[PDB]
From a paper:
The TolATEVQR complex is highly dynamic, especially in the cytoplasmic region. Another 3D class that comprised 78,674 particles showed significant displacements of some of the TolQ subunits. Further refinement yielded a 3.2 Å resolution 3D density and a second structure of the TolATEVQR complex, named TolATEVQR-II was built. Comparison of the two structures shows significant displacement of the cytoplasmic regions of TolQ chains A, B and C, whereas the structures of the transmembrane and periplasmic regions are virtually identical. The two structures of TolAQR described in this report show that TolQ can adopt different conformations, with a high degree of flexibility between the cytoplasmic and TM domains. This region has two conserved proline residues, Pro138 and Pro187, that introduce a kink in their respective α−6 and α−7 helices. Prolines are known to form kinks in TM helices and to be involved in signal transduction. These two prolines may modulate the widening of the hydrophobic pore that would not only loosen the restraints on the ExbD/TolR TM dimer, allowing it to rotate, but could also participate in the gating of the proton channel.
Author numbering:
A (entry chain Y): 13 to 38
B (entry chain G): 4 to 34
C (entry chain E): 5 to 225
D (entry chain A): 2 to 223
E (entry chain B): 7 to 224
F (entry chain D), G (entry chain C): 6 to 223
H (entry chain Z): 13 to 37
I (entry chain F): 6 to 32
The structure:
C-alpha cells in the first residue's frame, strides 16, 4: 500500500559525499 | 455522533504531552 | 548542548521543526484514537455476531434492539437496517420474495458502506504525513546545504571547517523528517490491514444474513 | 534569499535550464489546479446539500422534473442525477408494456452513468497532481546531478581550481532539487485532500441514489 | 564518446541494462495506454448498444456474426448468454442452475479479458521499484574506484580520482532516468485497470440480474 | 564494545539497551514459535491419519471429549463443528436444511481462534525487522552530533577528537543490523509456515461441510 | 582482486562467502524454476489443445492411464477429479451435485501438490532479496570499524592511509546488492508466473466442473 | 511481497561524509 | 531425478559466475 520513499534522501547524501570526495584532492 | 471529536481533543492533548516529555528527556540527556 | 545551537539555527530550520513536530503530534493523536476505535469495533462486531448466531429468534433480537435504535454500531447496525427494510417490504403487498430480499440486501449494503466510511475517517491523513514528511525533511537539508555552499563561495580562502555547523544543522532535518514519517507510514499500513479484516467480517455477516433471509422469504410461498 | 535577486539559472547549461522551466511550470500548474478544483468541489458540495433539502422538502416530483426541464442545459450534481433518473423512468414507464419492476432497473442504470459522468467532471485534473507529487523530486535530483557533472566539467582542464571557484556552481545545482521538492509538497498533500473530497461527493451521490431509487421503487407500485 | 569508451566493464553492463529498462518501460507505457484507451472505449460503446432495449437474442446473433476477435465487453456478454441459452435447452434444470451456468461462463471470460490488459504492468512495477538500486550499485562501484585513487599517492590528482566520481555520478543520473517512467505510469495504469474491472463487475450484476428474471419466467 | 559503552552519552544507554533488547526478544520469539508451528503441524497429520482410518466421526467426537480442555489444531476445528451440529440437528431435530451454515460458522470461529493462537507474536517480528534499522540511524545521528560538537571546539580538525563520535555511530548501526537480520529472515519463514498450516486446516472447509450436509439431508 | 580476500579480517571474508553462496544458490534457482515453469506452462497448453479437440472424456481418461507414473498439472487435476467422478457416479451417488462436489474435492487435493510441487524454492529468493543488502551493510560497517581500530593508534591520519581500508570494506555492500537484485526481480517475476498458472488451473477446474455438471445432471 | 531495504546505508554515508570534515585543511 | 537437476543447475551457474568474476578482473 504505502512506504517511505528513501531514494531521494539517499541520493542527496550520495551527491554531497561525491562533492566532498572530488574536493579532497584540491 | 459528535463525541469522536471530544476523544480526538483528548488524543491531541495526550499526544502533545508525550512529545513534550520526549523532547524534555532528549534535552536532559544532552548533559 | 543541542538547544544552544538550535536556538541560533536558521529561521527555515525553525519552521521545518514546527511543521514536522505538528505532523508528529497530529499523527500520534490519530494512531491512539484510531486504534482505540478499531479495538472497540472489532470487539462489538464479534460480541454481536455470536449473540445473533446463538439460535435465538431474529424477530425478538431485532425488537429488543429498538430500545437503542439511535445508538447502534457495526454488525448490529448492519443487521438492523437489513431486517427493518426486510420486515417492511414483506409486510407490504405486491412484492415477490426475490425483490423483498434484494431490497433488504441493498439497505444492508449501503449501511455497511456507511459504517466502514465512519470507521476509517482520518486514515488518509496518515498516508499524507508518511508521504510528505521525508520530503519536508529533505527540503530542510537541501536548503541548508545550498545556503552553506553559498556562504563558502563568499570567503577568499575556503575550507569545510567554517561551514561544518551549517551542514550539521542541515543534515538533522533529514533525520527528524524521517522519524516523523516512520510512525505514520507503518501505522497507515497496519490500520488498513485492520480495516480490511473488519470489512471481511461485515461482508461475511452480510452473506450469512442474506442467505437466511432468502430462505425465510421463499418458505412463505 | 541572501543571493542576487537579478541572477538565476540563466547562465547555466541548456538542460538544467530546461529542467528549471518544467519544474517551475509544474508548481504553477499545480497551484492553478488546486484553486480551480477547490472552487469547483466547494460549489458542488453546496449545490448537493441544497438539492437534498429541495428534494426532501416534499413538493411533488413532477414540479422538480418540469422546473429542471426549465434549466436542463445547466443541471449539475444531484439535480443532474435526479433528472437523468426521472427522464429515463418516465420514458420507460410510459411503455406500460414494460415489466413494472424492470422500469426501476433501467432508471437506476440511467442515474448510475449520470453519476459517473458528473463525478468524472469533478475529478478532471486531479491525476496530474498525483503525477507532479511523484516525479517532481526525481526530476529535481536529475537536474541537480546534471548540474554537478557540469560544474566539475567546467574546470576539468585545471587541477589548481580552488574550491572557491566551484562552490557557487554546486549551490546553483542544488536549486533544481529545492524547486523539485517545493513543487512536490503542495502537489501530493493537495492530491490526498482532493481525492478524499471526491470520495465524500461520491458517497453523498450514492446516498441520494438510494433515497431516489427507494421512493421510485415505491412510486412504481403504490 | 571517449569519456564512455574507457569506462570500467561493470559500468558498461550497468548502462546497457538501465538504458534497456528505460526503453522497455517507455514502450510498455505507450503500448498499454493505447490498449486501455481502446478497451475502455469498447466497453462504453457496447454497454450502451446492449442497454438500448434491442432484443438480447438478436444482439447475440449479430455478436456471433462477429465472433472473430470478439474480445471486450462483447465477449463477456457472449460467454454468459451462450451458456444461459444452451443450459436452458435442458428443461430439467431449476432456474438457480441456469443463473449459475451463465455467471460461471462470464466470470471466467472476465478474468481472461483482465489478464490480456494486465500483461506488462507487473514487469513495469518490478523495474520502477528495483531500477534506482541498480543505479545505487553502480554508484557504490564508482565510489570504490574513487577511494582507491585517494589511497594511491600522498596528494592524489583531480584527474586520477575523477573517473571513479564520473562513473559513480552517472550511475545515479541513469538510475533516476530509468525510474521516472515507471513511477508515474505504474500507479496510473494499475488504477486504470482497477476502474475497468469495476466496470465489468457492474456488468456482472446488471446482466445476471436480467437473466435471473428471465430464468424465473421462461 | 564495553570500552566505549562505559563512556557513551545517556541517550546511547537507552538506544543500545532497546536495540539489543529487541534482538533478545526476537530470538526468544523465534524459539517459542518454532516449537509451536512445528507441533501444530505434526498434530494436524496425527489427526488426519486417525480421521481417514475409517473410524466413525461419532467415535472421534466421543473419544475427543476426554481431552476437550486441551484440544488444539485440526481436531479443535472438528469438535467445534460437530458440537454445534449436534446442538442444532440432534439435540433438536428441526430444520435439517439450516444446520449446515451453523456448522460452517462453528468451524469458521474455531479456525480464526486456532490461527490467532499461532500468530500471537509474528506481527512484532514484522515491526522489529522494519524499525530496528531506524533506531540504528537514530543512534548514528546522535553519535554524529557528538562528533560535530567535538569538531567545533578546535580551529583545525583531525580524526583524533572525531573517532569516538564515529565509533558510536558505527556500533549503533551494527547492533541495528544484528537485530534486523534474524527478525526479517525469520518473519518470512514463519509467516509462510502459518499460511501453509492455514491452507492445511482449510482442507475441512468443503470436506467437513459436505459430510455434515449429507448427515443432515440423509 | 583476491589480494584483499587473502588478508582481510575473518568476518568480512566469511560474509563474502555467505553472499557469494546466496548469489550462486539464487541464480541456480532462477534458471531451474524458469525451466520447470516453462515446462509446466507448455504442458498445460498441450493438454488444453487435447481437451478442446472434442475427444470424449471417458476415452481421454484412458490416455492418462498409460502414464500413471508421469501425470502433472492440468492433466493431473483432470485425472484425479475424473477418477473420483467414475466412483461417485458408480453405485451410491446422492445428488448430481454430490457426485460433482466429491469429484471437485478430488481435483483440489491435487491443485495442492501440483502447486507446492512447483512453487518449491521461491520463498528462499524472498529471504535472499531481503537480507542480502543487510548482510552486505553489516560486512561494510564491520569493515569501517576494523579500519578505525588500526588507524586510531596513530597520532595523525589522512585519506592516503584510511581510504584503502574503506574501499575494501565497501565491496561487502556492492556484493550485497549484486546478490540481492537478481533475487528481488526473479522472486516477483516467478511469483507472478505461479499466480498466473494457479489462475489457469482454477479456471480449468471450475470450467471442467460445468461440463461435469452438464454430464451428471442431464 | 518482498523488496530491498537499504536504510542503514544512510548511516555509512553520514560516517563517510564526516571523514572529509575531519580531514579538510 | 530433481536432486541431480538442481546439482546440474548449481554446476552451470557456478561456472557462469567463475567466467564473470574472471572477466571482472580481466578489464
Amino acid at each position: 500500500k504505502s512506504e517511505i520513499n528513501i531514494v531521494p534522501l539517499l541520493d542527496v547524501l550520495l551527491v554531497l559525499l561525491l562533492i566532498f570526495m572530488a574536493t579532497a584532492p584540491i | 455522533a459528535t463525541e469522536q471529536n471530544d476523544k480526538l481533543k483528548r488524543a491531541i492533548i495526550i499526544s502533545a504531552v508525550l512529545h513534550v516529555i520526549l523532547f524534555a528527556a532528549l534535552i536532559w540527556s544532552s548533559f | 548542548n543541542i538547544l544552544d545551537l538550535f536556538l541560533k539555527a536558521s529561521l527555515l530550520v525553525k519552521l521545518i521543526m514546527l511543521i514536522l513536530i505538528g505532523f508528529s503530534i497530529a499523527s500520534w493523536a490519530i494512531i491512539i484514537q484510531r486504534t482505540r476505535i478499531l479495538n472497540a469495533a472489532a470487539r462489538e462486531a464479534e460480541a454481536f455476531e455470536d449473540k445473533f448466531w446463538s439460535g435465538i429468534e431474529l424477530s425478538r433480537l431485532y425488537q429488543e434492539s429498538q430500545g437503542k435504535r439511535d445508538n447502534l454500531t457495526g454488525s448490529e447496525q448492519i443487521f438492523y437496517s437489513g431486517f427493518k427494510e426486510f420486515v417492511r417490504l414483506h409486510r407490504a403487498n405486491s412484492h415477490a420474495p426475490e425483490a423483498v430480499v434484494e431490497g433488504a440486501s441493498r439497505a444492508m449494503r449501503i449501511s455497511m458502506n456507511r459504517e466502514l466510511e465512519n470507521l476509517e475517517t482520518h486514515i488518509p491523513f496518515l498516508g499524507t504525513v508518511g508521504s510528505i514528511s521525508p520530503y519536508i525533511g529533505l527540503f530542510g537539508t537541501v536548503w541548508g546545504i545550498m545556503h552553506a555552499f553559498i556562504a563558502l563561495g563568499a570567503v577568499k580562502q575556503a575550507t569545510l571547517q567554517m561551514v561544518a555547523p551549517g551542514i550539521a544543522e542541515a543534515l538533522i532535518a533529514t533525520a527528524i523528517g524521517l522519524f516523523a514519517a516512520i510512525p505514520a507510514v507503518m501505522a497507515y499500513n497496519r490500520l488498513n490491514q485492520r480495516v480490511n479484516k473488519l470489512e471481511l467480517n461485515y461482508d461475511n455477516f452480510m452473506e450469512e444474513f442474506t442467505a437466511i433471509l432468502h430462505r425465510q422469504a421463499f418458505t412463505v410461498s
